[PDB]
């Protein structure tokens, strides 16, 4: 007794393809690996309630492959299942709007994701993968489940695993349009270097944009000659630090030990705000263990001869 229902399949949720599914067989039997709003349905059999719904199915035909590459800018066959797997959790996360920004209530060690999401709403980033563009616009508004599930998928991270914020930005930065970004550095006889792309906007070793401009000791003195970017990201191993209102855009606080601690996010707005997931405190001065600081920028040229 052969019953059927109509569903849609997709790899990108923009191009829907209509499917008739035998209610007697499993989705996997008919589509291969198959997901519904994250939940893997590959060994379960169609339900009546399934009529009309969209189902994610790994690209098996060259059409789906093309649609898939064009949406994610990856060909990694495991990507879609990882995104769906991550998505099955992040959809249960809560995303409060703390301070006019979208955060994440703590869960499964997602403090790092929260801090990067907050940061990503405060700086000028144009994503090239449409998936990320679309996921980010929704996350700005308050629905950040997909952006977060994509971030894990691109960065090959499991739910529950604490990630490193600097490393994530780096990954994301490589999927964003930072081609126009330029950095000129001089070391001191005098040896000048030119950086571009993600290397133009990132530095490990000091938290202070002012120090970078004044002069940093190295194994000699390195100093910033020219910055052409919308922001710069100053990182360094965690260290006690005074954050002064108006002198930065935002910053990552890390308390704890290597690969087993906890991130908070500090934002300079009308005052210093500490966004700890769903929790929020306010202080005019802040001092704490900091490892990333962001500063907005347009164009900067040294005055050093
Ligand atoms: C590809 C190799 N990756 C090495 C780093 N891994 C990782 C994962 C998760 C976290 C929270 C941290 C971390 O804890 N990152 C921070 C950090 C804390 C403490 C110390 C740090 C030092 C250097 C630099 C950062 C530090 C010295 C002491 C907070 C920035 C790192 C990811 C990966 C395996």
UniProtKB/Swiss-Prot annotation:
Outcome of substituting residue 66 to A: Partial loss of ISG15 cleavage in vitro
Bilayer topology: Multi-pass membrane protein
Superkingdom classification of source: Viruses
Domain Peptidase C16: 71-305
LRR repeat locations: 117-139
Active site, renumbered: 111, 262, 276
Function: Responsible for the cleavages located at the N-terminus of the replicase polyprotein. Participates together with nsp4 in the assembly of virally-induced cytoplasmic double-membrane vesicles necessary for viral replication. Antagonizes innate immune induction of type I interferon by blocking the phosphorylation, dimerization and subsequent nuclear translocation of host IRF3. Also prevents host NF-kappa-B signaling. In addition, PL-PRO possesses a deubiquitinating/deISGylating activity and processes both 'Lys-48'- and 'Lys-63'-linked polyubiquitin chains from cellular substrates.
Protein name listed in UniProt: Papain-like protease nsp3
Organism encoding this protein: Severe acute respiratory syndrome coronavirus 2 (2019-nCoV)
Encoding gene, per UniProt annotation: rep
